[PDB]
Every structure is written in C-alpha cells, then in structure tokens.
Amino acid sequence: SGFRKMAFPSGKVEGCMVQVTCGTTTLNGLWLDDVVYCPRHVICTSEDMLNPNYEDLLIRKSNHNFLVQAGNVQLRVIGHSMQNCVLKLKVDTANPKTPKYKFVRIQPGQTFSVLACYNGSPSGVYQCAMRPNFTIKGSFLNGSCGSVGFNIDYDCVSFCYMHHMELPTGVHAGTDLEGNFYGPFVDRQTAQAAGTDTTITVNVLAWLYAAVINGDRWFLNRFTTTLNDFNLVAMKYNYEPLTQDHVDILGPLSAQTGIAVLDMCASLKELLQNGMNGRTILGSALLEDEFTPFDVVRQCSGVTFQ
Amino acid sequence: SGFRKMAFPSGKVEGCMVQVTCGTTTLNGLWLDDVVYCPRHVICTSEDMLNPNYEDLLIRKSNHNFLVQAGNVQLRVIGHSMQNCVLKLKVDTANPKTPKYKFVRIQPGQTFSVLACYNGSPSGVYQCAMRPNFTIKGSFLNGSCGSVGFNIDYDCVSFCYMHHMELPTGVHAGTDLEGNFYGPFVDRQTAQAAGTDTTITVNVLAWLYAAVINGDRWFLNRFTTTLNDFNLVAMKYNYEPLTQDHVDILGPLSAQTGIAVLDMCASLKELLQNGMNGRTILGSALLEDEFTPFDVVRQCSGVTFQ
C-alpha cells in the first residue's frame, strides 16, 4: 500500500545524455542513434537571446563549432540542421546505449518523468504534468536546458519534452523532440505569460480513487451530482470541464472501488465548496492533479519495466 | 528556479536488481560483486510468517533451493548465509554492472531514493525520509520486498535501506544492508506499532529556506525567538527538538538568504501556532519535513552525479 509521486527508472535515459557546447554556451543534448538533439538557443549569446534571428545565427556556425561530449569522450559532428526550435547534430558514431525509443507529443494533463541534468550529467529525476496552459512546474536551474521528459513502456522510451526556458513567472516551457513548443511560447528572452492554469479534473478524480484505495475514505459523501452541474461547479473553481471520455477513462477505478464516477464528482464538489477543514488526503492538504488515471492504476497494482 | 521532491538517477541501482525465489515466494535482491542480498523471509511460507524460526527454516534449505535470476539469465548459488535479517547468497559470477558502492546506516531525518521493484524489475523511483520513529511513508505493494533505498555521491552508491514489511498501520519498515532493522520492528506478521512520528524540525527549516530562495517570502515575520522558547513551542506540536548542531547545519542557507536561523524559527513558530490560513508554501498547504539541508543546497545550486 501507499501512494507516492513516482518517476520512471531513468537508466535508459541516463545513457543518452551528452554535453553540447557552442561558443560559450553549454547545455544538455539527447544522443540517439547518430543524432544529438538539443535546444537551438545553444547557438545564442546572452545578448542574442533578447532578439535572435536563428537562421542568420546558425549560418555563422559550422560543424566544428559544436562540441559534443559523452562523459569524457568527444563526438565528431558531420552535419547540423535546425528542425523548428531543436538543433540536430549528426555524429560519426551511433550511441551504443540507444534504447528502443519514440518521439511523442503528449496532451495537456498527461504526466512524464524529467531527468534534470547539468553539463550532460544526470542530477535528478522527478514526475511532472503538462499543465492545461502547456507549462510545467519543475526544478530547473541554469544549464538545465536540453533536459528531457519521458515515459517508459516496458522496453520503449517515449520522449515527450525538452526544456528550453524559465518564464519570468518561474514556471517552465519547452518543446517536443521535433522542436515544437508546448503552448504559445517562443525561445527568446521576452515578456511571455502563460494563461490561466486550470486544474486537471480527471487527475484529481483519479487521485481521490487512489485515496479511497489506500484507506482515506473520509471525503466520501452522501450526495451524487450531474455532469453538467459538476461542470457548473468546476468552472467557478478553474477546473477543466469533465467529459464522458474522462468518465470512461475512470471506469476501471470505479469498478475496483465500487464508487460511481458521479458520486466521486459530488464528493469533489463538496470538497471544492467547503474546503478540507484542516484535514489531509494522502498526506496532502490540497487537491492533487498530477496523477493520471493511468498513473493511479500503475501504482495501485504495480506494473514494472525493463 | 523551482523546488521539487527529487530522486537520484537510478541506473546504477537498476543494474543490480535481481529476482530471488525460494519455494513459492519471490522477491527482489541486490546483486553486488558475487553476493546477492535479500530479505531472509524469502524462505518463509505465508503461514511461517506468523511465527518464524529463521534458523530452523533456513536449515531445511540448500543452495539449489534459491533461484536467482538477473533479467532472464540464471545465477548459480554456491553458498548461503544469514546476517541478521538479510540472506547473503554467494553466486558464481560477479555482477559486471556493480557500481562503486558502500553500505551505510542512515540517521533518522536523513533522506534517500527508493527504487521500487517487482520480480527483480525496477518499476519506479521516489524520495523518502527515515522518520524519527524509524518508519518510511513509501509506495510498496506485494512483491516489493528487497527493494532498496540509496544515495549517490558522484560515482558511489551508498545503499541504506532494504524494504521488509508493511505494518498494519500502512507505513513501511526495513533494514540496513547488514540486515539490522531500522526501529524496533521484527520480520514476523504480528501486531507492531511505530511510536509517535515527530516532525523533522531542521528539515522544515531547510524547506522554508528553499521557499525563500524561490520567492515565497510571505511567512517571514517581524519576530525572533530563543532556541529554548522555540523548543517549548516545538514539543507541543510534536516537533523534534532543535539543537545547535542543526543551527550549524543550516548555517550556509542562512548566509545565502541573509536570514538568521532563529528568525526563521520564529516564523515557523508563528506558522505552527496560527496555521497557514489557506495559503501555500512551495505549492504545499502543509509544512514539509522530507528535505534535508543537504537536499535543499543540492537542488538550489544543482550538483550532478556520474
């Protein structure tokens, strides 16, 4: 028993982290097959980041301007290209530690594990959710750019995130591994704001199911509700609207716990309207929304990976 | 910027997880050099766990009764011994993935990363603290026994925990890698209770320092206090007494933030006496005590590992 915010095992991703240096800027790169992926702003100076013309800046750069280092070995770069906001450097040797992998663009509300790295060296691993406003609340210091977020499916690493910027808000933005930013953000040091950050309702419901599974049943009320009345309540509290797709996704936990989804919705509505009165649920005094139903099922019956 | 409960990279530990089966019971083992370490209750039946004589039970067992499997390869066991509550099985091949490692017995209040495994396969990684009552609040399902907790110091894995039991409380107990339990717990299915679980005061102080570093300064008050008056307040709220050793340990963060330790103690005392009034600190509506000052320094200036 027990419920914890849990990240995937990170060894297969550790095997792919390298250090990319261009000019005086050093960040992290992802070395898969004979290609190293990294943020393109590796070619920027500190002054260039205020208003960068990435095409003109990249044109001043040649293959030998990019120093790629795996541990303490040096990779020879034989070509470079810019795919959206990512730089792809073709190297002479394919990574012998390349895992079976895929590039995926996750949906808002989905979760992934971030391997925070510095100078190409992994430093930590933690779980994150792509917020509805397409930011993430991470732990990223200077030099962490190029760190990646991923999911593991037994043997296959699905990379979904590469970290590019910290907004003046303190939250973080990044791209998929094809270089397309999540959200309306751009890789320049300018005033950028993420919109209203709503709460992932289906995730909170899955978390309440996990709580019930682990013995925390105090919030279970005598009420039920309708989907439309629940959404009425959800819009007042900045909760994303609940759909029948969400109900179907929650199906399995409802069958395991014997609690209909709309009864859980009524309990959540009472929680939103009257607070928690100084109590805790699964050791938290807030409603947690960074656990998908998939996460809950996986951690409540314990699936493993390669 | 940002602050997250963050675990160590787990690849070096993943390389050492094997599956140990005795009779009908299968759990996880730690394969270092030519020795596999596992909980001794691997030799117990479900009925034996109610009152086990481990010496008599182990005497009915021979080397060939222990099946050790690394991935899908089988290890030949050439000897077995019982060190306190751990079984040590000598195998014929030394683990080629053995990292530089140490066995350490951590102190209450210290933290470590747990690699939750099932059938010798790593499934997740999360950060835990050894509670003052020598339990941990983890996520452990059936088959998770033998999962290990560790710390990483650049190249060296310090193993400190092996998971043996879930108490009827729902919290978890285990041993060091020499087989000595943390706390007064024994490996039999009987009524076992952990004492009062106090809050690690120095950890909460480090967490408040981390919050100040990350821009959350609302709790900084106009008061200061004495160590003895602060402990007066701490004993009422089940906080472990603060010592001058704790003040010295907090020294560096006090120098970084410009906030004396006793002023932070006064702020924490006001928080304890008047609650949080529906506010949050670092995204939490409770006082967090699972971050050591070492964790805070590491995550606020970003040290890396091999």
Question: What amino acid is encoded at B17 in this protein?
Answer: M
Q: To the nearest whole angstrom, how far is the Cα of A240 from the nearest Cα of chain B?
A: 19
Record: contact B6-A118, CB cut-off 8 A:
no
Which of A16, A22, A38, A41 does the annotation list as catalytic?
A41
Method used to obtain the model: X-ray
Looking at the partner chain, which of B8, B124, B280 has a beta carbon nearest the beta carbon of A124?
B8
Question: Is B1-14+100-197's fold the same as B15-99's?
Answer: yes
Record: contact B11-A14, CB cut-off 8 A:
yes
Which of B16, B22, B38, B41 does the annotation list as catalytic?
B41
d(CA A27, CA A24): 10
Which residues of chain A neighbour B150 with C-beta distances below 8 Å? none
d(CA A22, CA A49): 14
Record: contact A304-B119, CB cut-off 8 A:
yes
Question: What pairs with residue A151 in β-bridges?
Answer: A158
Estimate the share of chain B in helix, then strand, then coil, as percent rounded to the nearest 5. 25, 30, 45
Q: Cβ–Cβ contacts within 10 Å for residue A270, how many?
A: 17
SS3 category, A192: coil
In the annotation, is B145 catalytic?
yes
Looking at the partner chain, which of B6, B118, B283 has a beta carbon nearest the beta carbon of A137?
B283
Tokens 């000052």 sit at which residue? B293
Mutate: best of A4, A72, A155, partner B, most B CBs <10 A = A4
SS3 category, B119: coil
* Header resolution in angstroms: 2.0
Architecture of the domain made up of B198-301: Orthogonal Bundle (1.10)
Question: What pairs with residue B80 in β-bridges?
Answer: B89
d(CA B5, CA B291): 8
Q: How many helices (H) and strands (E) does chain B have?
A: 7, 13
Q: To the nearest whole angstrom, how far is the Cα of B59 from the nearest Cα of chain A?
A: 32
For residue A208, give the DSSP letter: H
Record: contact B137-A2, CB cut-off 8 A:
yes
Tokens 């959800």 sit at which residue? A234
SS3 category, B296: helix
Which residues of chain B neighbour A291 with C-beta distances below 8 Å? none
Looking at the partner chain, which of B2, B280, B303 has a beta carbon nearest the beta carbon of A170?
B2
Mutate: best of A114, A125, A303, partner B, most B CBs <10 A = A125
Handedness of CA A13, A15, A19, A20 (dihedral sign): negative
Residue count (chain B): 306
Architecture of the domain made up of A15-99: Beta Barrel (2.40)
Let me know the angle formed at the C-alpha of A47 by A41 and A53, rounded to the nearest 5 degrees: 50
Element (H, E) at A210: helix A201-213
Q: To the nearest whole angstrom, how far is the Cα of A147 from the nearest Cα of chain B?
A: 13
Max Cα distance, chain B (Å):
69
Which of B22, B38, B145, B265 does the annotation list as catalytic?
B145
Q: Do A168 and A135 contact (CB within 8 A), yes or no?
A: no
Which of A22, A85, A145, A160 does the annotation list as catalytic?
A145
Which residue in chain B is spatially nearest to A2 when comparing CA positions? B139
Which residues of chain A neighbour B303 with C-beta distances below 8 Å? 123
From residue A151, give the alpha-carbon distance in Å to each of A101, A158, A179, A300, B273.
10, 5, 18, 18, 43
Strand B156-166 vs strand B101-103: parallel, antiparallel, or unpaired?
parallel
Looking at the partner chain, which of A2, A125, A126 has a beta carbon nearest the beta carbon of B138?
A2
In the annotation, is A44 catalytic?
no
CB pairs under 8 A between A and B: 155
Instruction: Map out the domains of chain A as residue ranges.
Output: 1-14+100-197, 15-99, 198-301
Q: Do B181 and B127 contact (CB within 8 A), yes or no?
A: no
Q: Do A139 and A124 contact (CB within 8 A), yes or no?
A: yes
Record: contact B284-A280, CB cut-off 8 A:
no
The token pair that represents B192 in the structure block: 């076992």
At the top level of CATH, the class of A1-14+100-197 is mainly beta
Which residues neighbour A57 within 8 Å (Cβ) at sequence distance 6 or greater? Answer: A43, A44, A48
Q: Do A236 and A196 contact (CB within 8 A), yes or no?
A: no
Residue A42: closest CA among A56, A30, A29: A29
Which residues of chain A neighbour B300 with C-beta distances below 8 Å? 141
From residue B214, give the alpha-carbon distance in Å to each of A118, B3, B4, B278, B300.
19, 8, 11, 20, 9
From residue A79, give the alpha-carbon distance in Å to each of A64, A146, B99.
9, 19, 36
The token pair that represents B247 in the structure block: 């003040």
Which residues neighbour A36 within 8 Å (Cβ) at sequence distance 6 or greater? Answer: A18, A20, A29, A30, A68, A75, A77, A88, A89, A91
User: Helical H runs in chain B?
Assistant: 11-14, 54-59, 201-213, 227-236, 244-257, 261-274, 293-301
Which residues of chain A neighbour B115 with C-beta distances below 8 Å? 9
d(CA A210, CA A238): 22
The token pair that represents B246 in the structure block: 């704790």
